[PDB]
Every structure is written in structure tokens, then in C-alpha cells.
């Protein structure tokens, strides 16, 4: 009743939903506390992060820095691969990825620079080529500079600066912190007080208003005690702004409008401590003596309730919720509460490899000087136990264990952790993300599924700026760990692999482990011996893939692994529309190529092992449905490749031209055509047969080459093209070209006679 | 090891060890990498028995190129660290990425030399890279001349204030002696570079550079009014070793085309 590709498409749809059901942060950080860690040595194949390279500060910057009379400062523009150094009233930028960078100097400023930041521009203000705004704060004024960070052939942005005539006098309040919103709003704070200022700017000059203005959103008055800021933090997904004070007070501001900022929550350390005391587990790691050293916003895409992480100097991660009084009038919260605490790990870093209650007393992260959190929970903590050497604790969610945990009430904040040692003299200054923000889904459920996106986005990389250079730290995926572990099993026994494989099964489950083996066998992780590793991965896929069984059947873990891998290769495509109507393609062509290559390498792997992999060759009811299921998946793979080739062919022509000369029903069918329908549903095939029948018609009008477009459609997308149609196309070729040559007398009798043949 | 080789007249083997070490990712400072390369260069320039002239020259050449780039990198690092207008925060960062393995000329230009407006070093970089781009080269020459002029002007001003009783801006080391006129400091910059690149470079296209310097002299009154020799631009390039025929040849072109300031009287 239901054909192969439609059966396999059913497996894909159910697999997509399974990946998108990965637990949300609120669900495994429920009210309470946790100390769950599995620590890994930094040199281990199981390390969750590792240093990939380092970039020294240019010598010319050292010359300027040691030529500093009063004040110097370093900072990071990790979004574009740039660092900067300020010396008194002078500023120097440079691309730290470049092996011998040139210094972009800016010395117009008259007074000492106290803060520098790179923010988005205000829309409709600057030319489109301006990608950022550079904010330079001195003791006398704030200065805006236009920035164009266009990528270069080498892979590092080319940076050019533009003047703006936009500037404002600072005033009496120091500026040490500058943050920007998605829409280009610029907020300021510093070490004089807790006031928050905003800089406005516009293109037009007016007689009643300048191009650039500044206002104090705090409206202070009367008696005020000493208190100032330690940092500012933005969350665009909630239109919120957070400040942290030197007294560890957390203030929340809501952007109720494009020019408004309203304080809506103020929570001092006493309030946090009172919440903490009402929890079941109180600890001497958090008292009235403890300081909060850093905040990190948690976006609404990641979690609904938990808004904010706060790091104590004892290494405790405080996770705070925020809630509005009502459900309708963005809606501003009015309350904030400490709900969940992740306590520090216990293992300390060691040169030599050392050998179930809540651990709420560890001093391993005491003192924590700096801290950072990146979605889906990557945590960097600068521990400063000694005044000369920083130690870096880095941890990630144990995505594999969180995904397998059952039932939901057993979910805990499991983590994989490691210690990265920096050499003597390295003082960490800042840590920033160099790759695109992580997101496996568009809502909390599914958001943190690292496993699902292993092959859709590069692993996260982080630039660690020190006083001596920039270190690049990279997140390691399961396939990276699996490949590395197998690389150590190349010189060992049959039982050595089985032992290493059992470690993975106990953490990730059998399906995820076999899917990793399949991926490694197909060359994933090799963008980083390699033939032996891929052959070991093949051996693991065969030997430990399981088998089908009667419970309706339960297919092998080998089958589920193939379905899981294939689904994740096309997850960005499946439910997406093919086109966007001036019609264009929803998915960039470059992305369609890589997806197709991945699908084809998977197909090539199955063909080269059709004889050794169970279920591929034909075989009692169990192995029967195993063969049918595997067959259906392989038919979907070839259909996926044909479908992608068809879309690429389509946009190589002039689709808008083809779309114009088309009937309404077929325009509408093409309007809401998804990749799933193209791959697995007859209407996509029928519509594909219409489009090919239409593109060739147009190709003949351009008349570049018919027989080349023929052999293009004949072979690659065969089984969807028909050989009786190309001969027809060859006939309509001479017919139209007989109408092209129509004025000629002797040339047609050969065109029309051959068209008739 | 290298000391053993050399005393045994095995200079090429030592040059090989030293070069590889200079290119390696071991923890070696830039200055030590400069010493290693400089030694390899010497050791590869002399005969080592049993080894072909071709193999010697190729190593001596790789060491010479890497040594040239290394010296550039060292000039940068030093200048940046000492630069009063660079924030301390940045300097530490510069020292980390420049006081280690030798970087590519692209990086040195883009991330450091161009950002800090060290145009003289930019020019040395265009030389080491065989950079074929007359327009950019001249743009850099124009920036170097103007930058140097403004700096000389500033220093003469400070001096004039000392000799009049006034006070200099906070944190300005006075000049106890008449600093050089701007055209003297500019030509100093041109000499330093010339000696470093040897006039045979593409950063000394006399047909473009001589008119620009002459242009500068006119448009900034670097002439008799201030007690300078009106022919100073010509003296400069002649002593520098530009052949007489080429000079006159260019000057002819200047006179025939009547461009920029070379017009009217």
C-alpha cells in the first residue's frame, strides 16, 4: 500500500521529532542543586574541549604597551577575528588569525581610552557595506566610527574605518562597559555609579537636535550610597538588559520601546542568599562574604523560565528564573528568584593521572575570577588559585547522557569537564565566541541537541585572550571523540575495540554509538592512520550493530543508526520550502552541494560493503523487514540526491522566467513545495516532471545547447527524467530552431525533416 | 649538535637543523629565531663537501627570506610595545602573537603594520613580498611623507615654546635642541628605507616617486623661504645613487606634462 521512499520518509519524520524532543534546560535544571561531573584529562581522547592553536600578540603592540605612561587595556572582537589594544589615548586593532598582521592605528582621541566595543549598526542609517559600529569611550567623550568587516580570500575579515562626525561629551560618569543590541542600540555603564546611559544617533542633522545624543536612563536623585558596575549584559530575545554591581546586586531593565529603558527588577545579594537558604541544600560556598563576579544571559530560545546564570567567586553557578506578574499587556518580568545551583567539581588539575551525594563543599574553582557561558551551556571559568598562573576549567552538558536519560523525572545537569592549563605568566582577559551562535532548534525543546547538528554547523570555537596571545579552544563532538578513541585502538586486540566501544554505549546508547561509527566510516571527523580509523569504524558498525527481532518488529540498532545519520544530514532541508518567491532558493546552493556529497558518500559506503553488512544483501520475518527497511532508506537516499540535483539544475537556468510562463495551479504547487514532498511524494515527482518539461522549452529559446542539457537530465536525475522526453525535447529543438532559421530556405528542410524523424 | 657539525665543516647540515628549528612550533622567541636563521644563512652560503651547489643555494635562500620577514616582525613588535598611543591591554596581546613563530607577510601588514600606520614598515613589506601594485605603493609613500611632515612640524613647535617660556602639553619630553626642518626628517625616512631595500626595488619607481617628493617640496614651502636648498629633492636621489640619465629623463616628463603643482611660473 505504501511504497519504499514513503516508508523511509516516515522514519525520517519520526526521527526529526525525536531529535527535537531533546530536553530543555528548565527540565534538567529543576529547582534544587547538582554536582554531577565526569572529568576528563585534557590530553585524553574524551576531552570535551582542546586547544587547537595560539596567536602571539604582535611585537609592535608590546612596544606600545611597554611605552604606556598611565593606562593600557586589551580586548577581543571574536566575532570577526580581531583583537585590540589601547595605550593612553591611542587604539590599535589587528587580525589575530593573520600570521604577521598589520596594526590598524587610530589616534585621533585626545584623552585616555577607557572602553572599546564593536556593535551592530542602527538600520537605515549607514550604507549597507557598513557591518559594525566601533564605540570608543574616553574620559572626555564617546566616539562612533563606521566599520566594514568584509571577508577576504584567506578567511579573515578585512577591516576599514569610516568617520561619522558622531560624538558626545561623556560627562561625570566613567564608561568601562559598552554593549550593543541586535538593532544597534548602544548602552553604557562604568565604575562611577550604577547609572545606565544610552547613545542615540541618526543620519539627518536638525536645527533642534544633533546627529548624536546621550541620556541617563536611571534618573538618579537624592541620597545615594557608593556602588558601581562590574558588567553589562544584553538578551535580545527578551528585550532585556542586565547589570551587575560591585555589591553583587543584579538589576534587570526592559526595553519597552525603541528609545525606552525601564528598570523592572532589583535583586541584591541578600535576596539571592534568602532564596538559597530556602533551598534543601545550603552550603558554605555561598554566604554574605561571597561575591558574584559575572553574569551570563540565557536566551528565551534556550529556556523559558531560567533567564540568567550568575557565577560566584567560589565557583558556584546560580541559575535564576524571572516571571511576569501577568500574561498580557514584549512582556516585562517583575520578579527574579534563585532556583537552581550547579556546585563546583572536586577533581583538581594534575600532572600525573590520578585515580553519589550532592557535593556542595568543593574548593576546586575557588577563587573564580572570570566566567563565561555560551549556549547550549559551554562554561569557561578562570580559576586564580595562584597569583601568577590561571587555570581554565571548561565543561559542557553531557548531551549524550541527557538525551538517553529516562524517565524525565531522572533528568539532571550532567556535565563533561576538563582543565586546560595556561603557561606561567598568562593572565586571561576575555573569552569570546568565534563561530556562529549554537542552536539546534528554535525553541527550548530540541535547542541543546549537539548530536543533531554534528554535521550541519562546525564545532564551536572560542578565542581566549591573554596578556601574551590568543588561544583557540574548540568543542569536540561525539564523532571527534569516537574517531580519536578508535585511533588509539589501531594497535590493539579485537577485545580492545569492544572495550572502548562499550564505554560509548554506556554513555550515549547503542544507536548513537553505531551512528558515530557510521559517520567516522564515511569520513566525518577526517577534516581534522585515517584509513585504519575509518576501517575500524566500519568494523564497529558491522560487529556491534545488533540484529532485528520479534517484539510488528524491532529493527536492529544498525538500521536506526543509518536512519539517524541520514536524517541529521538533511534536517535543514526536509521541512523547508524549496523556493522563496523574483523567485529564489530557500537553501543556499553551497549548502545543497555539501548535503548531496554527504548523502552520496554514505551511499558509496553502503555499496562498497553490500556483501559484509547484514541486511543489505537479500536473506525469518525479522531479517525480512530488516532488508525491506534498509532497502527503503537506500531508495530515499538516491531520491534525495536526484531531488537536490534537480533543484540545482533549476536555478542554473532562469527560474523567474520559467515561473512567469506558468499556470497558477503549478505556481501555487511550487510555492508551497517542500523538500520532503520532492523526495518522497508523487506530487513532487509529477511537478518535477512538469518543470523539466518547461525548462527545456525555455532552454531552446536561449538555444545555447540542447544536447548538453539533454545528457545533463538524462543520467544524473534519471528515474525521474524519461528517455522518451529527451528525444521529444530533441524534436522540439529542431522545431523551434526551424522557426528560428525560418527565413532561410535550404536549412529548414533538414531541420524539419530531422524533427519529423 | 650544530656546534659539532660546524667544527667538522658540515655547515649545510647545521643550516638545516637551525632552519627547521626556526620554522618549528617549539617554544622559541622571535629573536632566537632570528639568530637561528642568521646562522643558517651563513652556513648555507659556504661550500659543504658532498652537497650540490643547488641544494646549498636553495637553503641559503629560504633562510634569507625568512630572516627578512623575521626582522620586519621584530621591528613591528618593538615599535608597538613602545608606542605611547597603544593601550596596555592591547600590547600584551600583540606580544603574544608576534614573539613566537614567524608570521606571514599578509598578517604582518593587515593585523599590525597597517593598523598602526607604520608606513615605512608597510613599504618594507611590499618589498619582501614582491608586491606588484604601483598605486598602493605610492599611496603608502604619500602617507609616509605627510605623517613625517606633521611630526616634524609638531616637534619644531614644541621647541619654539621652550624658547619662549611656555609650557608643553602634559607628558611631552622637551627638545633641548632645534629639531630638523620637516624636509630633513622626511628625506631621513627615505634614506633609511632606501638603504634597507637597495633602490632596485619596486618601492622606488623613480618615475612616480621623484615627482611626488618634488610636489611635496613645493606644496609645503620646503624651499628658500626657510633656508633650504631648493634643489634638495634632486640632491637626495642623486646621492642615493639614482643614475643621472634617469633623473633628467623624469624631469623632462615633469616639464612637458605640466601636472599637479608643476605649472605656470
Amino acid at each position: 500500500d505504501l511504497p519504499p521512499v514513503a516508508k523511509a520518509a516516515q522514519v525520517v519524520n519520526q526521527t526529526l521529532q525525536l531529535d527535537d524532543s531533546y530536553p530543555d534546560l528548565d527540565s534538567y535544571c529543576r529547582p534544587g542543586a547538582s554536582s554531577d561531573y565526569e572529568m576528563q584529562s585534557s590530553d585524553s581522547s574524551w576531552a570535551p574541549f582542546h586547544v587547537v592553536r595560539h596567536h602571539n600578540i604582535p611585537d609592535k603592540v608590546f612596544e606600545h604597551l611597554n611605552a604606556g605612561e598611565v593606562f593600557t587595556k586589551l580586548g577581543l572582537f571574536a566575532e570577526i577575528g580581531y583583537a585590540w589594544a589601547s595605550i593612553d589615548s591611542s587604539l590599535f586593532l589587528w587580525d589575530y588569525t593573520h600570521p604577521n598582521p598589520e596594526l590598524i592605528g587610530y589616534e585621533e582621541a585626545t584623552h585616555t581610552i577607557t572602553a572599546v566595543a564593536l556593535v551592530p549598526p542602527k538600520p537605515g542609517v549607514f550604507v549597507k557595506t557598513i557591518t559594525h559600529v566601533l564605540v570608543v569611550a574616553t574620559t572626555s567623550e564617546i566616539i562612533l566610527l563606521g566599520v566594514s568587516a568584509t571577508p577576504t580570500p584567506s578567511g579573515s575579515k578585512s577591516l576599514t574605518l569610516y568617520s561619522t562626525r558622531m560624538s558626545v561629551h561623556r560627562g561625570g560618569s566613567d564608561v568601562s562597559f559598552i554593549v550593543g543590541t541586535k538593532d544597534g542600540r548602544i548602552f553604557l555603564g562604568g565604575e562611577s555609579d550604577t547609572d545606565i546611559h544610552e547613545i542615540f544617533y541618526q543620519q539627518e542633522e536638525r536645527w533642534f537636535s544633533s546627529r548624536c545624543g546621550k541620556i541617563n536612563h536611571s534618573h538618579p536623585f537624592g541620597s545615594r550610597q557608593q556602588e558601581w558596575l562590574r558588567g553589562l549584559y544584553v538578551d535580545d530575545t527578551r528585550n532585556l538588559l542586565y547589570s551587575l554591581s560591585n555589591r553583587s546586586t543584579i538589576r534587570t531593565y526592559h526595553m519597552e520601546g525603541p528609545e525606552k529603558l525601564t528598570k523592572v527588577i532589583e535583586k541584591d545579594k541578600t535576596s539571592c542568599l534568602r532564596d538559597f537558604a530556602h533551598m534543601a541544600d545550603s552550603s558554605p560556598l555561598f554566604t554574605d562574604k561571597t561575591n558574584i563576579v559575572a553574569l551570563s544571559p540565557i536566551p528565551a530560545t534556550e529556556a523559558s523560565k531560567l533567564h540568567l546564570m550568575a557565577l560566584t567567586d567560589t565557583g558556584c553557578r546560580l541559575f535564576l528564573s524571572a516571571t511576569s506578574s501577568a500574561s498580557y499587556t514584549a512582556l516585562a518580568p517583575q520578579s527574579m528568584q534563585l532556583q537552581f545551583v550547579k556546585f563546583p567539581p572536586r577533581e583538581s588539575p594534575t600532572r600525573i593521572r590520578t585515580l553519589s551525594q550532592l557535593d556542595k563543599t568543593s574548593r576546586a574553582l575557588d577563587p573564580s575570577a572570570l566566567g563565561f557561558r555560551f549556549s547550549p551551556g559551554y562554561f569557561f571559568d578562570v580559576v586564580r588559585k595562584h597569583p601568577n598562573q590561571d587555570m581554565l576549567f571548561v565543561s559542557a552538558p553531557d548531551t549524550g547522557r541527557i538525551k538517553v536519560t529516562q524517565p524525565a523525572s531522572a533528568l539532571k545537569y550532567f556535565e563533561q569537564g576538563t582543565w586546560i592549563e595556561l603557561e606561567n605568566g598568562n593572565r586571561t582577559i576575555e573569552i569570546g565566541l568565534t563561530t556562529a551562535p549554537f542552536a539546534a532548534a528554535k525553541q527550548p525543546l530540541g535547542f541543546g541537541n549537539e548530536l543533531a547538528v554534528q554535521f550541519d554547523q562546525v564545532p564551536g570555537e572560542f578565542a581566549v585572550l591573554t596578556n601574551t596571545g590568543v588561544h583557540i579552544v574548540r568543542r569536540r563532538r561525539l564523532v571527534d571523540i569516537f574517531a580519536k578513541a578508535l585511533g588509539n585502538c589501531v594497535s590493539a586486540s579485537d577485545d580492545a575495540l569492544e572495550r572502548e566501544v562499550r564505554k560509548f554505549i554506556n554513555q550515549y546508547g547503542r544507536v548513537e554509538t553505531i551512528a558515530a561509527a557510521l559517520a567516522v566510516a564515511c569520513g566525518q571527523g577526517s577534516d581534522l592512520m585515517d584509513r585504519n580509523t575509518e576501517n575500524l569504524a566500519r568494523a564497529a558498525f558491522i560487529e556491534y550493530g545488533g540484529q532485528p527481532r520479534l517484539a510488528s518488529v524491532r529493527l536492529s540498532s544498525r538500521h536506526d543508526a543509518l536512519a539517524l545519520y541520514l536524517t541529521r544530514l538533511v534536517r535543514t532541508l526536509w521541512k523547508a520550502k524549496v523556493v522563496q518567491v523574483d523567485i529564489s532558493s530557500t537553501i543556499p546552493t553551497s549548502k545543497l552541494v555539501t548535503i548531496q556529497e554527504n548523502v552520496e558518500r554514505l551511499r558509496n559506503f553502503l555499496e562498497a560493503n553490500k556483501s559484509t553488512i547484514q541486511g543489505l544483501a537479500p536473506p525469518d520475518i525479522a531479517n525480512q523487514k530488516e532488508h525491506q527497511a534498509l532497502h527503503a532508506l537506500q531508495k530515499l537516499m538516491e531520491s534525495i540526491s536526484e531531488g537536490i540535483s534537480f533543484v540545482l539544475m533549476l536555478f542554473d537556468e532562469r527560474v523567474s522566467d520559467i515561473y512567469a510562463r506558468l499556470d497558477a495551479v503549478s505556481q501555487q504547487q511550487l510555492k508551497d513545495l517542500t523538500y520532503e514532498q520532492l523526495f518522497s511524494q508523487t506530487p513532487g515527482k509529477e511537478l518535477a516532471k512538469v518543470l523539466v518539461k518547461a525548462i527545456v522549452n525555455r532552454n531552446i529559446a536561449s538555444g545555447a545547447n540542447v544536447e548538453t542539457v539533454a545528457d545533463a537530465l538524462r543520467r544524473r536525475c534519471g528515474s525521474f527524467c524519461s528517455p522518451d522526453d529527451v528525444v521529444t525535447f530533441k524534436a522540439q529543438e529542431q522545431l523551434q530552431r526551424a522557426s528560428e532559421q525560418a527565413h532561410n530556405s535550404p536549412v529548414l528542410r533538414a531541420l524539419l525533416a530531422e524533427s519529423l524523424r | 649538535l650544530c656546534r659539532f657539525y660546524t667544527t667538522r665543516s658540515r655547515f649545510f647540515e647545521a643550516a638545516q637543523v637551525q632552519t627547521n628549528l626556526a620554522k618549528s612550533d617549539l617554544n622559541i622567541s622571535l629573536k632566537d629565531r632570528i639568530i637561528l636563521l642568521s646562522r643558517a644563512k651563513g652556513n648555507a652560503s659556504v661550500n659543504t663537501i658532498g652537497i650540490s651547489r643547488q641544494q646549498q643555494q636553495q637553503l641559503n635562500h629560504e633562510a634569507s627570506e625568512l630572516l627578512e620577514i623575521a626582522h620586519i616582525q621584530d621591528d613591528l613588535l618593538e615599535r608597538l610595545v613602545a608606542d605611547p598611543r597603544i593601550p596596555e591591554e592591547r600590547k600584551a596581546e600583540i606580544e603574544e602573537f608576534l614573539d613566537g613563530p614567524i608570521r606571514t607577510l599578509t598578517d604582518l601588514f593587515n593585523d599590525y603594520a597597517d593598523q598602526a600606520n607604520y608606513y615605512d614598515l608597510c613599504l618594507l613589506i611590499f618589498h619582501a613580498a614582491d608586491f606588484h601594485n604601483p598605486r598602493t605603493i605610492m599611496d603608502t609613500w604619500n602617507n609616509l611623507i605627510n605623517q613625517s611632515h606633521f611630526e616634524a612640524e609638531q616637534r619644531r613647535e614644541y621647541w619654539e615654546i621652550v624658547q619662549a617660556g611656555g609650557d608643553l602639553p602634559a607628558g611631552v619630553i622637551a627638545p633641548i635642541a632645534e629639531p630638523p626642518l620637516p624636509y630633513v626628517y622626511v628625506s631621513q625616512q627615505i634614506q633609511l628605507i632606501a638603504h634597507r631595500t637597495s633602490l632596485d626595488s619596486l618601492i622606488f619607481p623613480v618615475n612616480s616617486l621623484l615627482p611626488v617628493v618634488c610636489a611635496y617640496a613645493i606644496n609645503n614651502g620646503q624651499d628658500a623661504s626657510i633656508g633650504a636648498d631648493p634643489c634638495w629633492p634632486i640632491q637626495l636621489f642623486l646621492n642615493l645613487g639614482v643614475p643621472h640619465a634617469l633623473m633628467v629623463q623624469v624631469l623632462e616628463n615633469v616639464l612637458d606634462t605640466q601636472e599637479a603643482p608643476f605649472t605656470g611660473r
Binding site: N100, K157, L159 | -
Partner: peptide, 19 residues
């Protein structure tokens, strides 16, 4: 590297503190 690659597109502002 003795090969130059100009890329004004995406640099790091030399005249600002870091994010």
C-alpha cells in the same frame, strides 16, 4: 608567512576595549 592578504572587511577595532 611571507604572503600578504589584505582584508579590511572583518578586523578588530584597534581603538576600543574588548567585548
Amino acid at each position: 608567512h611571507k604572503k600578504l592578504v589584505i582584508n579590511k572587511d572583518m578586523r578588530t577595532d584597534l581603538f576600543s576595549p574588548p567585548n
